[PDB]
């Protein structure tokens, strides 16, 4: 919930990045997390999506009594139970989907944080502040997982603590 609003301008993925530096702003999406979310959602869809041939009569044109009432009662019980089962299943699956999407977003945030180490500090709006000069190659390195923090650590620590 620490990320307030979504981005309607990023239409190439579910989770992504936005940055600002000396060379401007930009936007890029994360394939690994979007793919993970889609695979989980589709696997859940496939589990949701019987072969009955001869059953009892369910519609009656005459009033008979005991047997007809038993048939009606059995059918009503079956429909009520399956309706409840469907409602419970959809509620549970929707709750799980929302929880897993939020978890994926938090996972990406924590992964970026653990990448940055002492070179950056979280601003609280779900998104970071980097304390050293970071060009587009730098942002690319953070995004694809090849960000080396030791070659910026000195100036990052100088900028972070010593004013």
């Amino acid at each position, epitope marked *: 919930g620490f990320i307030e609003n979504g981005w309607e301008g990023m239409i190439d993925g579910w989770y992504g990045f936005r940055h*600002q530096n000396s060379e401007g*702003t930009g936007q890029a999406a994360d394939l690994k997390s979007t793919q993970a979310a889609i695979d989980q959602i589709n696997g859940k869809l496939n589990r949701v999506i019987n072969e009955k041939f001869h059953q009892i009569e369910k519609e009656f044109s005459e009033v008979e009594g005991r047997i007809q009432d038993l048939e009606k009662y059995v059918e009503d019980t079956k429909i009520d139970l399956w309706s409840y089962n469907a409602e419970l299943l959809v509620a549970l699956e929707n709750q799980h989907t929302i929880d897993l999407t939020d978890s994926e977003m938090n996972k990406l945030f924590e992964k970026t944080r653990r990448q940055l180490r002492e070179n950056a500090e979280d*601003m609280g*709006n*779900g*998104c970071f502040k980097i304390y050293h000069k970071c060009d587009n190659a730098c942002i690319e390195s953070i995004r694809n997982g090849t960000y080396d923090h030791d070659i910026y650590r000195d100036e990052a620590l100088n900028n972070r603590f010593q004013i």
Partner: nanobody, 125 residues
Framework: VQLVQSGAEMKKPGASVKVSCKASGYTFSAYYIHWVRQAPGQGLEWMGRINTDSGGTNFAQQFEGRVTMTRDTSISTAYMELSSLRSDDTAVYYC???????????????????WGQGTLVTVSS
């Protein structure tokens, strides 16, 4: 996401013109609408922008006193009214949605997307 405008208007000098811009595919009251003018053979000229929620408007310091911008959220259409027409006011008028680039708590630039098809307004006797 698209923006659809009105047709051409052959107005006479010393009159008023209203050009409509209907939004479909997005929440109209969530984005700004910008009006850009392109004279025949010349470049684009920003006229102003209108807030589709609170009705605020911000013109350029060249169209003040001649342009009034209004919105209609019920039908999702933004109007531009231009008064005191002249011969030089003949151009193609564009309506564009302005996207702001929000980096958390602050905004940094943006772009115009989508653009309308443009209405050609001609002023002559």
């Amino acid at each position: 996401v698209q923006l659809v405008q009105s047709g051409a208007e052959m107005k006479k000098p010393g009159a008023s013109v209203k050009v409509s811009c209907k939004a479909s595919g997005y929440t109209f009251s969530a984005y700004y609408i910008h009006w850009v003018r392109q004279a025949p053979g010349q470049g684009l000229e920003w006229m102003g922008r209108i807030n589709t929620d609170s009705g605020g408007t911000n013109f350029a310091q060249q169209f003040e006193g001649r342009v009034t911008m209004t919105r209609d959220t019920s039908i999702s259409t933004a109007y531009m009214e231009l008064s005191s027409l002249r011969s030089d006011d003949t151009a193609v008028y564009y309506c564009a949605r302005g996207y702001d680039f929000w980096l958390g708590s602050y905004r940094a630039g943006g772009w115009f997307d989508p653009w309308g098809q443009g209405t050609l307004v001609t002023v002559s006797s």
